Amino acid sequence: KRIYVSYGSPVIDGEVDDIWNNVEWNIPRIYSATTQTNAKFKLMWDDNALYVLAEVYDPVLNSANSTPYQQDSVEIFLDENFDRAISYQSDDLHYRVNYNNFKTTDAGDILRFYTKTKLLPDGYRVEARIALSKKPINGTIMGFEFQVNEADSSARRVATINMFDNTGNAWQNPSLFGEIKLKGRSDNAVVPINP
Ligand SMILES: OC[C@H]1O[C@@H](O[C@H]2[C@H](O)[C@@H](O)[C@H](O)O[C@@H]2CO)[C@H](O)[C@@H](O)[C@@H]1O
Ligand SMILES: [Ca+2]
Ligand SMILES: [Ca+2]
Ligand SMILES: [Ca+2]
Protein backbone atom coordinates (compact mmCIF):
# COMPACT_ATOMS: atom_id res chain seq x y z
CA LYS A 1 0.00 0.00 0.00
CA ARG A 2 0.74 3.75 0.17
CA ILE A 3 1.83 6.40 2.69
CA TYR A 4 1.01 10.06 1.94
CA VAL A 5 3.99 12.23 2.92
CA SER A 6 3.54 15.88 4.00
CA TYR A 7 6.00 18.67 3.08
CA GLY A 8 8.30 20.07 5.80
CA SER A 9 11.93 20.64 6.83
CA PRO A 10 12.92 19.06 10.21
CA VAL A 11 16.15 19.67 12.12
CA ILE A 12 18.41 16.60 12.38
CA ASP A 13 19.29 16.32 16.11
CA GLY A 14 17.41 13.25 17.48
CA GLU A 15 14.80 15.60 19.04
CA VAL A 16 11.11 15.62 17.99
CA ASP A 17 10.53 18.91 16.11
CA ASP A 18 7.16 20.56 16.78
CA ILE A 19 6.35 19.98 13.07
CA TRP A 20 6.69 16.21 13.46
CA ASN A 21 3.63 16.38 15.76
CA ASN A 22 1.50 17.47 12.75
CA VAL A 23 2.15 14.18 10.93
CA GLU A 24 0.91 10.63 11.62
CA TRP A 25 2.87 7.64 12.92
CA ASN A 26 3.14 4.65 10.57
CA ILE A 27 3.19 1.33 12.44
CA PRO A 28 5.09 -1.54 10.75
CA ARG A 29 3.16 -4.73 11.55
CA ILE A 30 5.05 -7.51 9.68
CA TYR A 31 6.95 -9.48 12.32
CA SER A 32 9.32 -12.34 11.38
CA ALA A 33 8.76 -13.81 14.92
CA THR A 34 7.08 -12.88 18.21
CA THR A 35 9.00 -10.18 20.15
CA GLN A 36 8.37 -7.43 22.71
CA THR A 37 10.11 -5.04 20.27
CA ASN A 38 7.81 -2.67 18.37
CA ALA A 39 8.38 0.52 16.35
CA LYS A 40 6.74 3.45 14.56
CA PHE A 41 8.01 6.00 12.04
CA LYS A 42 6.95 9.31 10.51
CA LEU A 43 7.97 10.64 7.08
CA MET A 44 8.31 14.14 5.69
CA TRP A 45 9.76 15.61 2.47
CA ASP A 46 11.21 18.89 1.32
CA ASP A 47 12.66 20.19 -1.93
CA ASN A 48 16.02 18.49 -1.31
CA ALA A 49 15.31 15.45 0.86
CA LEU A 50 13.26 12.72 2.46
CA TYR A 51 13.14 12.63 6.29
CA VAL A 52 12.46 9.71 8.58
CA LEU A 53 11.71 9.80 12.31
CA ALA A 54 11.68 6.34 13.88
CA GLU A 55 11.09 5.28 17.51
CA VAL A 56 11.84 1.71 18.56
CA TYR A 57 10.58 0.12 21.80
CA ASP A 58 13.22 -2.50 22.52
CA PRO A 59 14.26 -3.32 26.15
CA VAL A 60 17.67 -4.80 25.27
CA LEU A 61 20.01 -2.99 22.87
CA ASN A 62 22.82 -4.97 21.29
CA SER A 63 25.38 -4.10 18.62
CA ALA A 64 28.19 -6.54 19.47
CA ASN A 65 27.84 -8.59 16.24
CA SER A 66 30.09 -7.24 13.44
CA THR A 67 27.33 -7.97 10.89
CA PRO A 68 25.39 -4.65 10.62
CA TYR A 69 21.89 -6.15 10.35
CA GLN A 70 22.65 -8.38 13.33
CA GLN A 71 22.66 -5.22 15.51
CA ASP A 72 19.57 -3.39 16.74
CA SER A 73 19.13 -1.05 13.79
CA VAL A 74 16.65 0.46 11.38
CA GLU A 75 16.87 0.22 7.59
CA ILE A 76 15.42 2.61 4.99
CA PHE A 77 14.89 1.54 1.37
CA LEU A 78 14.14 3.94 -1.51
CA ASP A 79 13.25 3.41 -5.17
CA GLU A 80 13.61 7.06 -6.14
CA ASN A 81 12.61 6.81 -9.84
CA PHE A 82 9.79 4.37 -9.03
CA ASP A 83 11.14 1.79 -11.57
CA ARG A 84 9.83 -1.13 -9.46
CA ALA A 85 12.55 -3.31 -11.04
CA ILE A 86 13.05 -6.83 -9.63
CA SER A 87 16.71 -6.20 -8.89
CA TYR A 88 18.62 -3.12 -7.70
CA GLN A 89 19.16 -0.27 -10.18
CA SER A 90 21.69 2.49 -9.65
CA ASP A 91 19.06 4.90 -8.23
CA ASP A 92 17.96 2.31 -5.61
CA LEU A 93 18.94 3.00 -1.99
CA HIS A 94 19.34 0.74 1.04
CA TYR A 95 20.60 2.42 4.21
CA ARG A 96 20.95 1.26 7.84
CA VAL A 97 21.70 3.04 11.14
CA ASN A 98 22.02 1.40 14.59
CA TYR A 99 20.95 2.83 17.98
CA ASN A 100 24.53 4.26 18.41
CA ASN A 101 24.15 6.10 15.09
CA PHE A 102 26.55 3.78 13.25
CA LYS A 103 25.57 4.01 9.57
CA THR A 104 25.99 1.46 6.74
CA THR A 105 25.00 1.45 3.07
CA ASP A 106 24.02 -1.70 1.18
CA ALA A 107 23.12 0.34 -1.97
CA GLY A 108 23.63 4.03 -2.71
CA ASP A 109 26.04 6.82 -1.83
CA ILE A 110 26.23 7.08 2.02
CA LEU A 111 27.15 10.78 1.59
CA ARG A 112 23.41 11.29 0.97
CA PHE A 113 22.54 9.82 4.43
CA TYR A 114 22.64 12.03 7.52
CA THR A 115 21.41 10.69 10.89
CA LYS A 116 21.21 11.26 14.62
CA THR A 117 19.99 8.87 17.36
CA LYS A 118 18.95 9.22 20.99
CA LEU A 119 18.69 6.59 23.73
CA LEU A 120 15.28 6.58 25.32
CA PRO A 121 14.05 4.67 28.43
CA ASP A 122 13.11 1.34 26.84
CA GLY A 123 14.47 2.07 23.36
CA TYR A 124 15.86 4.57 20.86
CA ARG A 125 14.97 7.19 18.28
CA VAL A 126 16.49 7.62 14.83
CA GLU A 127 16.14 10.82 12.90
CA ALA A 128 17.35 10.56 9.30
CA ARG A 129 17.71 12.69 6.15
CA ILE A 130 18.17 11.25 2.65
CA ALA A 131 19.26 13.79 0.01
CA LEU A 132 17.05 13.23 -3.11
CA SER A 133 18.57 13.59 -6.62
CA LYS A 134 15.33 13.86 -8.55
CA LYS A 135 13.64 17.17 -7.60
CA PRO A 136 10.39 15.97 -5.91
CA ILE A 137 7.07 17.76 -6.54
CA ASN A 138 3.52 17.24 -5.24
CA GLY A 139 2.41 13.92 -6.71
CA THR A 140 5.88 12.30 -6.90
CA ILE A 141 5.62 8.59 -6.09
CA MET A 142 8.65 6.67 -4.81
CA GLY A 143 9.03 3.10 -3.68
CA PHE A 144 9.91 2.88 0.01
CA GLU A 145 10.49 0.24 2.68
CA PHE A 146 11.24 0.51 6.45
CA GLN A 147 12.72 -2.35 8.53
CA VAL A 148 13.76 -2.86 12.16
CA ASN A 149 16.42 -5.43 13.06
CA GLU A 150 15.85 -6.77 16.62
CA ALA A 151 18.98 -8.24 18.30
CA ASP A 152 19.15 -9.91 21.76
CA SER A 153 21.83 -10.34 24.43
CA SER A 154 23.38 -13.22 22.44
CA ALA A 155 24.59 -10.55 19.89
CA ARG A 156 22.45 -11.89 17.01
CA ARG A 157 19.37 -10.73 15.12
CA VAL A 158 16.39 -12.62 16.50
CA ALA A 159 13.55 -10.78 14.67
CA THR A 160 12.68 -8.25 11.93
CA ILE A 161 9.78 -5.81 11.65
CA ASN A 162 8.78 -4.57 8.18
CA MET A 163 6.30 -1.97 6.94
CA PHE A 164 5.53 -3.47 3.49
CA ASP A 165 7.57 -6.56 2.53
CA ASN A 166 6.76 -9.84 4.24
CA THR A 167 9.16 -12.06 2.32
CA GLY A 168 12.70 -11.19 3.43
CA ASN A 169 13.58 -9.93 -0.02
CA ALA A 170 13.46 -6.09 -0.04
CA TRP A 171 17.24 -6.08 0.17
CA GLN A 172 17.31 -7.79 -3.25
CA ASN A 173 14.10 -6.74 -4.92
CA PRO A 174 12.75 -3.13 -5.19
CA SER A 175 9.45 -4.32 -6.68
CA LEU A 176 8.77 -5.48 -3.13
CA PHE A 177 8.87 -1.97 -1.63
CA GLY A 178 5.61 -0.15 -0.85
CA GLU A 179 4.81 3.35 -2.02
CA ILE A 180 5.13 6.90 -0.73
CA LYS A 181 3.31 9.77 -2.44
CA LEU A 182 4.55 13.34 -1.73
CA LYS A 183 1.88 16.02 -1.07
CA GLY A 184 1.30 19.41 0.58
CA ARG A 185 3.92 21.84 -0.79
CA SER A 186 2.47 25.32 -1.47
CA ASP A 187 2.53 26.55 -5.08
CA ASN A 188 3.39 30.19 -4.23
CA ALA A 189 6.24 29.71 -1.67
CA VAL A 190 5.92 32.44 1.04
CA VAL A 191 5.52 36.23 0.64
CA PRO A 192 6.61 38.61 3.53
CA ILE A 193 6.00 36.71 6.84
CA ASN A 194 4.85 39.88 8.61
CA PRO A 195 6.22 40.66 12.14
O1 LIG B 1 18.90 -14.13 3.81
C2 LIG B 1 20.33 -14.05 4.00
C3 LIG B 1 20.97 -12.96 3.12
O4 LIG B 1 21.00 -11.71 3.83
C5 LIG B 1 21.66 -10.63 3.21
O6 LIG B 1 21.52 -9.78 4.22
C7 LIG B 1 20.37 -8.92 4.25
C8 LIG B 1 19.45 -9.22 5.43
O9 LIG B 1 18.98 -10.56 5.39
C10 LIG B 1 18.25 -8.31 5.28
O11 LIG B 1 17.25 -8.52 6.26
C12 LIG B 1 18.68 -6.87 5.32
O13 LIG B 1 17.59 -6.15 4.76
O14 LIG B 1 19.69 -6.64 4.37
C15 LIG B 1 20.83 -7.46 4.30
C16 LIG B 1 21.55 -7.01 3.04
O17 LIG B 1 22.92 -7.15 3.38
C18 LIG B 1 23.11 -11.00 3.11
O19 LIG B 1 23.90 -9.82 2.90
C20 LIG B 1 23.17 -12.12 2.08
O21 LIG B 1 24.54 -12.48 1.87
C22 LIG B 1 22.37 -13.32 2.63
O23 LIG B 1 22.10 -14.31 1.64
CA1 LIG C 1 14.71 16.94 15.13
CA1 LIG D 1 14.52 2.49 -8.87
CA1 LIG E 1 17.18 -5.64 20.99
Q: Is residue 187 part of a domain?
A: no
Ligand 1: residue of 67, 69, 144, 162 to mutate (most ligand atoms within 8 A of CB) is 69
- In terms of residue numbers, what domain contains 78? 2-182
| Residue 185: CA count within 13 A, CB half-sphere | 19
Q: How far is the CA of 99 from the centre of ligand 4 (A)?
A: 10
CATH number of the domain encompassing residue 84: 2.60.40.1190
At a CB cut-off of 8 Å and minimum separation 6, what does 4 contact? Answer: 180, 181, 183
Is residue 21 a part of any domain in this protein? Answer: yes
Question: Is residue 192, in this structure, part of any structural domain at all?
Answer: no
Q: In degrees rounded to 5, what are phi and psi of residue 173?
A: -140, 95
Q: Please indicate the experimental technique that yielded this structure.
A: X-ray
Asked if 47 and 138 count as a contact pair (C-beta separation under 8 A), the reply is no
Residue 13 is assigned to a ligand binding site = yes
Which of 51, 65, 10 shows the shortest CA–CA distance to 146?
51
Residue 102 in domain: yes
- Within 13 Å, how many C-alpha atoms sit on residue 101's CB side? 13
Q: Is residue 195 part of a domain?
A: no
Looking at the structure of the chain, the number of domains it has is 1
User: Do the Cβ atoms of 86 and 174 come closer than 8 Å?
Assistant: yes
DSSP character string of 71-109: SSEEEEEEETT----SS--TTEEEEEEETT--EEEEES-
- Determine the Cα–Cα distance for residues 19 and 116; give it in Å rounded to an integer: 17
Determine, yes or no, domain membership for 193. no
Distance from residue 171's CA to the centre of ligand 1 (Å): 7
